[PDB]
Amino acid sequence: PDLEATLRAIVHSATSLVDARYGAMEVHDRQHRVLHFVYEGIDEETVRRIGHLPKGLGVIGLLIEDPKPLRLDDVSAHPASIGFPPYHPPMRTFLGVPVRVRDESFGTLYLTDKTNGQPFSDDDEVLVQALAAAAGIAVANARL
Amino acid sequence: GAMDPDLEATLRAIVHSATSLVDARYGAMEVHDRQHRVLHFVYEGIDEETVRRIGHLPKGLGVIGLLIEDPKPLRLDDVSAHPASIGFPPYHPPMRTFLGVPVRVRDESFGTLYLTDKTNGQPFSDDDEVLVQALAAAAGIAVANAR
Ligand code: HEM
Ligand code: HEM
Ligand SMILES: [C-]#N
Ligand SMILES: [C-]#N
Ligand SMILES: [Ca+2]
Numbered sequence: 001p002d003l004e005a006t007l008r009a010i011v012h013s014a015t016s017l018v019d020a021r022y023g024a025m026e027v028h029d030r031q032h033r034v035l036h037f038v039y040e041g042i043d044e045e046t047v048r049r050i051g052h053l054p055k056g057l058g059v060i061g062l063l064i065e066d067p068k069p070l071r072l073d074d075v076s077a078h079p080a081s082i083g084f085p086p087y088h089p090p091m092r093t094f095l096g097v098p099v100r101v102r103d104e105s106f107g108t109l110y111l112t113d114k115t116n117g118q119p120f121s122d123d124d125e126v127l128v129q130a131l132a133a134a135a136g137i138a139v140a141n142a143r144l
Numbered sequence: 145g146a147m148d149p150d151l152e153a154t155l156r157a158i159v160h161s162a163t164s165l166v167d168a169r170y171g172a173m174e175v176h177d178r179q180h181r182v183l184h185f186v187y188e189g190i191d192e193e194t195v196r197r198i199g200h201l202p203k204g205l206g207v208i209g210l211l212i213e214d215p216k217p218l219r220l221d222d223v224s225a226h227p228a229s230i231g232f233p234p235y236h237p238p239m240r241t242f243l244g245v246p247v248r249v250r251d252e253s254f255g256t257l258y259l260t261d262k263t264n265g266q267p268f269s270d271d272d273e274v275l276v277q278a279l280a281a282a283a284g285i286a287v288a289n290a291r
Contacts, residue, residue, distance in 0.1 A: 001288075001289075006285055006289075009281070009285070010282065010285065013278045013281065013282060016278065017165075017275060017278055017279070101150045102149060102150055102153070123161075123164055123165070126157075126160070126161055126164070127161040127164075127165065127279075129157060130154070130157035130158050130160070130161045130279070130282065131279075131282050133150070133153065133154040133157055133286070134154055134158070134282040134283065134285045134286040134289075135285075136150070136154075137150055137151060137154060137285075137286045137289045137290055138285060138286075138289045140150070140289075141289040141290070
């Protein structure tokens with residue numbers, strides 16, 4: 001059972017189901033080390049140009065710190081925003097939710113740039129929570 | 145006994161999102177074993193009093209029974225008009241429009257996610273079927289991994 005592939009399929013589904021241009025999932029350990037980073041909407045050449053993987057700083061760092069849903073009209077405007085690295089696609093609208101089970105949170109599922117230029121909806125948020133939950137069971141199952 | 149609580153919350157959340165996403169009046173999911181024996185059932189859209197009047201849970205017969213045995217997407221304008229249909233039990237809401245999809249992974253199917261009575265009064269669309277398939281595949285990842 002390839003967990004990386006499983007998490008990637010979840011991200012793929014999330015991006016499609018809520019019409020985001022971009023989607024990503026980070027999964028970390030308790031020491032906040034990056035275990036998995038999977039994504040959709042970004043070409044391999046761009047990925048290469050970005051270079052270093054995200055470390056879970058800024059806005060995602062906020063959700064790792066306090067796991068709960070967060071929608072933003074403009075992720076750059078958030079006080080905690082660290083900004084994009086060189087070569088990274090610019091992104092504006094944002095939806096992120098923990099990837100968890102009841103006992104523990106392991107990750108964050110996040111989507112940007114809904115293709116209609118609108119912020120993500122309440123319904124979008126609830127849907128992504130549901131997909132996140134399926135991911136959470138996968139992660140919990142890989143741990144113990 | 146009871147479903148694993150994380151699995152149960154997940155499967156409930158999926159039914160809920162599916163029901164909202166495709167504008168269905170009612171939404172349900174059955175999960176069965178490899179012998180096709182129904183083990184768990186979750187649903188939404190039916191009040192507690194009605195559930196009490198209905199009484200017995202579904203056994204995986206009729207149209208859902210068909211989908212358990214031959215797992216693939218099925219849309220119907222009028223579910224009770226299908227040749228495999230067994231009919232609604234006493235006190236069950238009558239239901240017309242139907243969308244049902246298997247809950248599965250590559251090598252195994254565990255269940256069926258199904259929705260009825262789209263609120264616009266129309267049948268469920270191609271778009272509806274595609275999206276509910278995506279929610280069902282997520283349910284499949286969850287079932288396979290709770291296990
Ligand atoms: C395609 C899906 C992606 C999404 C939705 C996404 C989203 C974001 C967002 C919203 C930020 C800003 C956070 C802030 O301002 O605080 C950010 C920063 C960042 N991104 Fe991405 N990104 C994606 C792909 C990638 C890829 C492929 C890489 C590199 C392989 C990457 C590397 C980074 C890095 C290094 C940061 C700085 C913050 C950190 O290290 O945590 N991103 N990303
Ligand atoms: C609210 C979500 C529900 C949906 C979408 C739904 C859908 C359906 C449909 C379409 C049928 C017809 C099958 C056929 O004619 O072959 C059916 C039958 C049946 N329903 Fe439901 N129903 C729901 C709730 C319930 C509840 C809450 C109960 C019990 C408390 C129940 C008990 C039954 C039983 C016993 C049958 C006969 C077939 C069988 O045993 O599997 N249903 N349902
Ligand atoms: C992007 N992390
Ligand atoms: C009703 N099953
Ligand atoms: Ca709607």
